[PDB]
Amino acid sequence: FKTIDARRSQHLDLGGSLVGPESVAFDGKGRGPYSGVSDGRIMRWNGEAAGWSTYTYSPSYTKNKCAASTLPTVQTESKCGRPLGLRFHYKTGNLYIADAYMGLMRVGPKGGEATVLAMKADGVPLRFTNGVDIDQVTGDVYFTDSSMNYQRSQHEQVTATKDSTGRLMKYDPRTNQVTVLQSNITYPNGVAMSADRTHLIVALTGPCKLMRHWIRGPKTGKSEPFVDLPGYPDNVRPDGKGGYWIALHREKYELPFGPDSHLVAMRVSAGGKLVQQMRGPKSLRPTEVMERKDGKIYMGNVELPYVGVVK
């Protein structure tokens, strides 16, 4: 597993002044990246020719006439929503959205306006709904809230202040219920279920760590250290080979490796060992890394006006 070069990469441009396709989710039919962008919409990629089509959005997006808003998105975020985490339930074709302001939402295979499933957990409202993954067998949804204090706009303040008010939660699609599995977490972000489905791997952005929370067997409810990372992790996604790709939006240590050779992602094994690194420009600031069958690796962010593609 040689270091992947992210210097040369194809840009799937978003229209208008849209930026920050934080997640790069693929549906059960393998259709091109679905991405939650700066203005509150979840856009779908349909190739070079057709480009990005609107797929889904929060009820607040419609209600507040956000489509015809003139003001910069950083200001109209809490009104229009900011979709971060994306994952498809293959059996139904449903898309689960982790929206920073609008909480956990879901939409059908046809798309259109989404439905808010949860905006609160144990009476406390969700202020920074970030990471999501699905148990593909049961349809259970595991998602994170990064802070009770700071909204997405001040995500850097979660790190700066060492804020530890984050929550890891389960949404049960049968009982329509939201349980808090773990609270007082230091900036929980990305979440991925393990291949063997016994635990979750959760990214702690500020701490620069992955942790393991068990969801099955005698250790159910136990959170433990998994591995320390030399970068600030965002989203955790399976690499399609039993491990995970971890997006690293910043390095913890600026190692002098010459120009445009910054650590922007790490492939981690099921056992929590460092397998492979991806180095590229500092501007990439990746939030999600999605390897595919055809060797291509799709990359999300919160700042750039495109999805990046390497290999």
Numbering used by the authors: 38 to 348
What sentences appear in the manuscript?
An indole-3-acetic acid (IAA)-glucose hydrolase, THOUSAND-GRAIN WEIGHT 6 (TGW6), negatively regulates the grain weight in rice. Ishimaru and Hirotsu et al. first identified THOUSAND-GRAIN WEIGHT 6 (TGW6), a gene that limits the number of endosperm cells and rice grain weight. An enzyme activity assay confirmed the IAA-Glc hydrolase activity of TGW6 using recombinant TGW610. From another point of view, the hydrolysis of IAA glycoconjugates by TGW6 has been considered to function in auxin metabolism.
The crystal structure of TGW6 was determined at 2.6 Å resolution and exhibited a six-bladed β-propeller structure. The Root Mean Square Deviation (RMSD) of the corresponding atomic positions in 12 molecules were calculated less than 0.5 Å by the DALI server. According to the result of structural similarity search, the structure of TGW6 was classified into six-bladed β-propeller structure. Furthermore, some proteins with structural similarity to TGW6, such as diisopropylfluorophosphatase (DFPase), gluconolactonase (XC5397)23 and drug resistance protein 35 (Drp35), retain calcium (Ca2+). In contrast, the highly conserved Ca2+-binding motif in structurally similar proteins was not completely conserved in TGW6, and a Ca atom was not found at the site using single-wavelength anomalous diffraction. Therefore, these results implied that the Ca2+ ion does not bind at the partially conserved Ca2+-binding site in TGW6 or that the binding affinity was very weak even if the ion interacted. Thermal shift assays revealed that TGW6 preferably interacted with indole compounds among the tested substrates, enzyme products and their analogs. Firstly, the docking pose of IAA-Glc was simulated when the IAA portion of the chemical structure bound to the inside of the molecule around phenylalanine (Phe)-165, histidine (His)-192 and tyrosine (Tyr)-224 in TGW6 (subpocket A; the interior portion of the nipped pocket), whereas that of Glc interacted at the site relatively close to the molecular surface around Glu-193, arginine (Arg)-287 and Glu-343 (subpocket B; the outer portion of the nipped pocket). Notably, the IAA moiety bound to fill the shape of subpocket A, whereas subpocket B still had a vacant space. The interaction map of IAA-Glc in the presence of TGW6 suggested that Tyr-224 was involved with hydrogen bonds, His-192 and His-286 interacted as aromatic-aromatic contacts, and Leu-121, Phe-165, His-286, threonine (Thr)-324 and valine (Val)-339 were engaged in hydrophobic interaction with the IAA substructure.
